[PDB]
């Protein structure tokens, strides 16, 4: 009887159990009908639990028993190219998953002495990101923006860009329509990115307890390669929906509210998850694998997504998370409707890792181009009230316009490191000063086409190794000078 209990109350997907004198905190609980729950609080007389499934089939007076194991999910290399729900059960109808290991869903990040500084870059294909907001293996960067602004496109492009790098990927969908998930899966399968990707889905009709638990299961699935000297990349499509589900569960549990009716431990809820994405040293890998692999360092990169209301980054949850990650990428509605499709707002978007996660040529060339844009934004906002100004204002405004026109890109169009380096050098050296504000995209597109049709050895040398010296910069200058004349945009 110490492991069996009965249900006394069911309401809104939360079940209070009488009995179960021996059960631990967070342990799995089995109902009749293949329904699993987890404990939440162990009072003096009863036990509380949420249901991971459809609670419409539970009645007062039924039976339950304790499994003896905390929440677990199947982890391994056999999950690549599959679609599962928050518990690891496939839903795509392709058959069972032959797992070999299971891992805990909730755990703690490694300590301070077990970490390493990030120095290996991660490529996404966007000029506005790879030159101003670098991303490195082990760094976590936030994608923040409004509704209908293009947040999901960036994550899918980043996933696609890892075809040759050799790093696994995980995609989590929380509180989304089933049609959108199916479309995303179809698009991933179209480009062959499904061969190294896993998808965890929790739709808008799924219970709040399932949308709450999905990111932790996804992170646990991603940690498998981190612990074994291999890299990975995980995307949470909306952490706002997880916060809303947690708020619903807390309010249904009578916890006192606070700002915007959010309870305490919201910061803890969003912090204990993103703290698990880190780069561990070789000693940690050696200890974990018992000497199976030596001289290897693991990593895990995260790209959470948060949406705002009316472009207000000063709200409670939008700021909480900013105070956790190592940077943010802000997408503005005003620029998106104007025509700037990758609408990246410089000045409000920063990277905390900095230039340590870049190739040498990109790190040296792309120096302080975000602060200039941030200054130019306010200068252009203020300088419409003047009549006569010196040439400094004209030059700064023209340079700002040219740079803001340069960083426009089309979807599904990755750029190599050489193209970014050539374009950034052309912008910095001042060669595009005489070019009109229009035809800037045409100019750099034609320049890249000419530099790829010719100069193939130099371009491939830059692509393989990201170093440059007097010889390479002289070659770049000679090539762009040759292109400037005897060519058409």
């Amino acid at each position: 009887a110490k492991n069996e209990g009965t249900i006394v109350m069911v309401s809104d997907g939360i079940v209070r159990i009488h009995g179960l004198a021996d059960a631990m905190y967070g342990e799995m609980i089995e109902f009749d009908g293949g329904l699993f729950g987890m404990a939440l609080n162990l009072e003096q007389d009863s036990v509380g639990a949420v249901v991971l499934g459809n609670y419409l089939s539970l009645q007062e007076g039924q039976k339950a028993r304790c499994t003896g194991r905390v929440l677990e999910v199947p982890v391994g290399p056999e999950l690549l190219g599959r679609v599962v729900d928050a518990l690891g059960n496939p839903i795509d109808g392709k058959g069972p998953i032959d797992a070999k290991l299971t891992d805990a869903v909730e755990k703690v990040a490694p300590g301070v002495i077990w970490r390493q500084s990030v120095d290996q870059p991660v490529q996404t294909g966007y000029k506005s990101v790879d030159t101003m907001i670098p991303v490195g293996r082990g760094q976590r960067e936030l994608i923040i923006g409004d509704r209908q602004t293009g947040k999901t496109a960036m994550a899918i492009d980043a996933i696609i860009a890892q075809k040759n790098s050799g790093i696994k990927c995980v995609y989590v969908a929380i509180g989304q329509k089933q049609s959108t998930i199916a479309n995303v899966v179809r698009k991933l399968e179209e480009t062959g990115a499904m061969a190294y990707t896993t998808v965890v889905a929790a739709a808008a009709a799924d219970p709040a307890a399932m949308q709450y638990l999905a990111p932790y299961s996804g992170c646990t699935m991603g940690e498998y390669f981190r612990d074994r000297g291999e890299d990975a990349l995980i995307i949470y499509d909306d952490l706002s929906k997880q916060a809303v589900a947690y708020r619903q569960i807390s309010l249904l549990l009578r916890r006192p509210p606070g700002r915007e009716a959010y309870p305490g431990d919201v910061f803890y809820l969003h912090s204990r998850l993103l703290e698990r994405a880190s780069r561990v040293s070789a000693e940690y890998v050696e200890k974990f694998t018992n000497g199976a692999v030596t001289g290897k360092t693991g990593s895990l990169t995260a790209l959470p997504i948060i949406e705002t209301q009316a472009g207000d980054v000063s709200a409670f949850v939008p700021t909480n998370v900013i105070s956790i990650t190592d940077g943010q990428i802000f997408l503005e509605t005003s620029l998106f409707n104007a025509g700037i499709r990758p609408a990246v707002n410089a000045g409000i978007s920063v990277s905390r890792v900095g230039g340590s996660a870049q190739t040498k040529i990109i790190k040296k060339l792309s120096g302080g181009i975000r602060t200039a844009l941030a200054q130019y934004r306010e200068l252009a906002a203020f300088a419409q009230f003047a009549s006569d100004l010196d040439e400094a204002t004209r030059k700064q405004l023209e340079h700002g316009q040219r740079v803001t026109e340069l960083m426009k890109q089309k979807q599904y169009a990755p750029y190599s490191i050489a193209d970014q380096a050539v374009s950034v050098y052309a912008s910095n050296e001042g060669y595009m000063a005489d070019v009109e504000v229009k035809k800037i995209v045409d100019f750099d597109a034609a320049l890249i086409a000419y530099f790829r049709s010719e100069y193939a050895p130099l371009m491939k040398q830059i692509d393989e190794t990201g170093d440059y010296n007097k010889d390479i910069e002289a070659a770049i200058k000679a090539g762009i000078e040759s292109f400037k004349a005897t060519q058409t945009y």
Binding site: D12, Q59, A182, A208, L251
Partner: protein, 463 residues
């Protein structure tokens, strides 16, 4: 097996049952003798079920008997419901006799799984030029209707019903969530006059009913539309069905009122803690399945003109297109009065609808925007002091504005002009030709309320 009422506080009623046979959540109950019926909402200890009455609690004491149906509320579904008015319980309120249908379906159901979603996104053709060109629909999508009274909302709904029934051999279901009685009577008589009533089934939720009635009235229409979609003829092929909700705002308001009645901690700005889940329950059953499809037209009210309020914020996460009915267009004698610049759609991208359709749509929108930005210049200074390209833009914009209007079937009994069902190709051809500059000599009057493009040519030749 039987129960007995123990508490009566307004609408909330608590019923005590046996040790074992305690009805599940949402299982309807019937009170013996009295007409009223109950619905389960929450289970408490000692075999006590907290319910909500669907009728009225005047004249009810403590100790009456209650019989459990052991099933959710079931409603009659079939072909015999076309042209009949029902309430939330599926009972006729038109004094026309009992419904001949014998089969029933439960109104509580799970959404279709991930494997049942269609493998493509196909457009739905309506025969209206502006809607088909600038705000294309989608099989399984959701459209928000932003418009007040006196602009032709009911006429548009009736026209869409007639168009779908004639073209795609589909049917429709109309659900009124918290509607006025006067407007309901007027709508019924208008449809009966327009010979549209015999291809639509309606459920009415009155404004003076307890919130339990106005909360669960959309699920009845959902169930009827689901039965219509799955009904297979030879070779399956299902059907394409529509669904109208009179106001989605009142649905959330009724949910809030019910949550407040039962007693639970309010969320931000006083809304219920379970809001997004409650709306996703409704909006996840409108999908396109391998057998058929369901499309929804919903009218949305924005409280206090605050787009950041929780209700519109939760509503907009499911909408695929927005139709805006403007009063200036109606006052300018153009029907249907749909704003061509403030109406948006997610399907207007080159990947879904092709390249040339997208190009023509954006070119038309650009011309309209240029005309809008030049109208104030014309007013403030005059038609003169302008070059020729702006004048050409003005003339082409006027031609497009006139061409956006067309006659309707449901107006034949009033004016006598026949209705039109212009297909997408002809609209694309005509607008491409107009943008090219071929029809730069036709008088603008020939483009007004004419329909197609060869009709434009004939009308211009007659003048």
């Amino acid at each position: 097996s039987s129960g007995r009422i123990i508490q009566i506080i307004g609408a909330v009623i608590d019923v005590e049952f046996e040790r074992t046979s305690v009805p599940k959540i949402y299982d309807a109950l019937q009170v013996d003798g009295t007409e009223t019926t109950l619905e389960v909402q929450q289970q408490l200890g000692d075999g006590v079920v907290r319910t909500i009455a669907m009728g009225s609690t005047e004249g009810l004491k403590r100790g009456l008997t209650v019989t459990s149906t052991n099933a959710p509320i079931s409603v009659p579904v079939g072909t015999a419901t076309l042209g009949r008015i029902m309430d939330v319980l599926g009972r006729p309120i038109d004094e026309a006799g009992p419904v001949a249908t014998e089969e029933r379906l439960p109104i509580h159901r799970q959404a279709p799984s991930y494997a049942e979603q269609a493998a493509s996104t196909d457009l739905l053709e309506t025969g209206i030029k502006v809607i088909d060109l600038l705000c294309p629909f989608a099989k399984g999508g959701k459209v928000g209707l932003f418009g007040g009274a006196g602009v032709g909302k009911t006429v548009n709904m009736m026209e869409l019903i007639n168009n779908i029934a004639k073209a795609h051999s589909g049917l429709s279901v109309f659900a009124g969530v918290g509607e006025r009685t006067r407007e309901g009577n007027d709508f019924y008589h208008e449809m009966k006059d327009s010979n549209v009533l015999d291809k639509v089934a309606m459920v009415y939720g009155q404004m003076n009913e307890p919130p339990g009635n106005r909360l669960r009235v959309a699920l009845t229409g959902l169930t009827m539309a689901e039965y219509f979609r799955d009904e297979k003829d030879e070779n399956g092929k299902g059907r394409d069905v529509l669904l109208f909700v009179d106001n989605i705002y009142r649905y959330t308001l009724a949910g809030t009122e019910v949550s407040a009645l039962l007693g639970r901690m309010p969320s931000a700005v006083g809304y219920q803690p379970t809001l997004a889940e409650e709306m996703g329950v409704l909006q996840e059953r409108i999908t396109s399945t391998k057998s058929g499809s369901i499309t929804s037209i919903q009218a949305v009210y924005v409280p206090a003109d605050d787009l950041t309020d929780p209700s519109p914020a939760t509503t907009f996460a499911h909408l695929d297109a927005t139709v805006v009915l403007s009063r200036d267009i109606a006052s300018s004698g153009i029907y249907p009065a749909i704003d061509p610049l403030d109406s948006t759609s997610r399907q207007l991208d080159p990947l879904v609808v092709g390249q040339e359709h997208y190009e023509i749509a954006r070119a038309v929108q650009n011309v309209l925007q240029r005309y809008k930005e030049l109208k104030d210049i014309i007013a403030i200074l005059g038609m003169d002091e302008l070059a020729e390209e702006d004048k050409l833009v003005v003339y082409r914009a006027r031609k497009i504005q006139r061409f956006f209007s067309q006659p309707f079937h449901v107006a034949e009994v009033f004016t006598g002009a026949p209705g039109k069902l212009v297909p997408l190709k002809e609209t694309i051809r005509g607008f491409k030709g107009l943008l090219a500059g071929e029809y730069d000599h036709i008088p603008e009057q020939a483009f007004y309320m004419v329909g197609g493009i060869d009709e434009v040519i004939a009308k211009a030749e007659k003048l």
